[PDB]
């Protein structure tokens, strides 16, 4: 009964999305093996860079974004789970579930982006395969794809970013609004929303 029951495990960060240079690319930091193991110890002491990480759990694998000191992700993927570090466990700082959000500390090594000020509705959606989607924004949580994609393309990519021309954080990847499996919107947590939770 009660002796017999399991712990989830952490959320494990498996690599990252590199947007450093001229070039946005996924880059792995972590086999299935190894994050397994971290996920159950929640003991992670690989090297972690800059502001969109790449993580997973045991059934899922999405994205997380460090903004003011904050990484980021979706409730829908993390649920309440603490996050592996280089000391064990980190419990959440943020959790709500009406805003699909949760966040912990920024993990040492992480660079973070700041919240955008401009006031611009051209966005740019960042996936976990990299790929730089332009976003025109339609009202406060949501924007549309100037060219639509099959669902399929948008998985796994909640937790990720909408930057602005400047490469401010607009907001975080939450939902994909499909009609017949094409996604022709998003629906993101504004970063005003994440300011107001801090
Ligand atoms: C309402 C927010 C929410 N909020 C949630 C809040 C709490 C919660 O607690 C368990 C669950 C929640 N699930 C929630 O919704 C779930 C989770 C989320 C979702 O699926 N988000 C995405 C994603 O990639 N997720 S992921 O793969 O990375 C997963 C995290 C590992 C963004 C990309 C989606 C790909 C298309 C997948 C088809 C699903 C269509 C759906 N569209 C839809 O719902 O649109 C409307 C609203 C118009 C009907 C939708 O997008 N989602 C459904
Ligand atoms: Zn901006």
Not at 21 to 27: E, F, K, S, V
Not at 53 to 61: C, D, G, H, L, R
Not at 127 to 145: C, E, K
Not at 172 to 194: C, N, Q, W, Y
């Amino acid at each position: 009964h009660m002796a017999s029951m399991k712990k989830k495990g952490s959320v494990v960060i498996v690599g990252r999305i590199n947007l450093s240079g001229d070039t946005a690319y996924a880059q792995q930091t972590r086999g299935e093996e190894g994050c397994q193991e971290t996920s159950q110890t929640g003991r992670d002491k690989n090297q972690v860079e800059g502001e969109v990480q790449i993580v997973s759990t045991a059934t899922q694998t999405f994205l997380a974004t460090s903004i003011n000191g904050v990484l980021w992700t979706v409730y829908h993927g993390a649920g309440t789970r603490t996050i592996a570090s280089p000391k064990g466990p980190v419990t959440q700082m943020y959790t709500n579930v009406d805003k699909d959000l949760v966040g912990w500390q920024a993990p040492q090594g992480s660079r973070s982006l700041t919240p955008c000020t401009c006031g611009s509705s051209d966005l740019y959606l960042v996936t976990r395969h990299a790929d730089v989607i332009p976003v025109r924004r339609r009202g406060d949580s949501r924007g549309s794809l100037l060219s639509p994609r099959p669902i399929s393309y948008l998985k796994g990519s909640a937790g990720g970013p909408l930057l602005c021309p400047a490469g401010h954080a607009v907001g975080i990847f939450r939902t994909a609004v499909s009609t017949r499996g094409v996604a022709k919107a998003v629906d993101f947590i504004p970063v005003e929303s994440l300011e107001t939770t801090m």
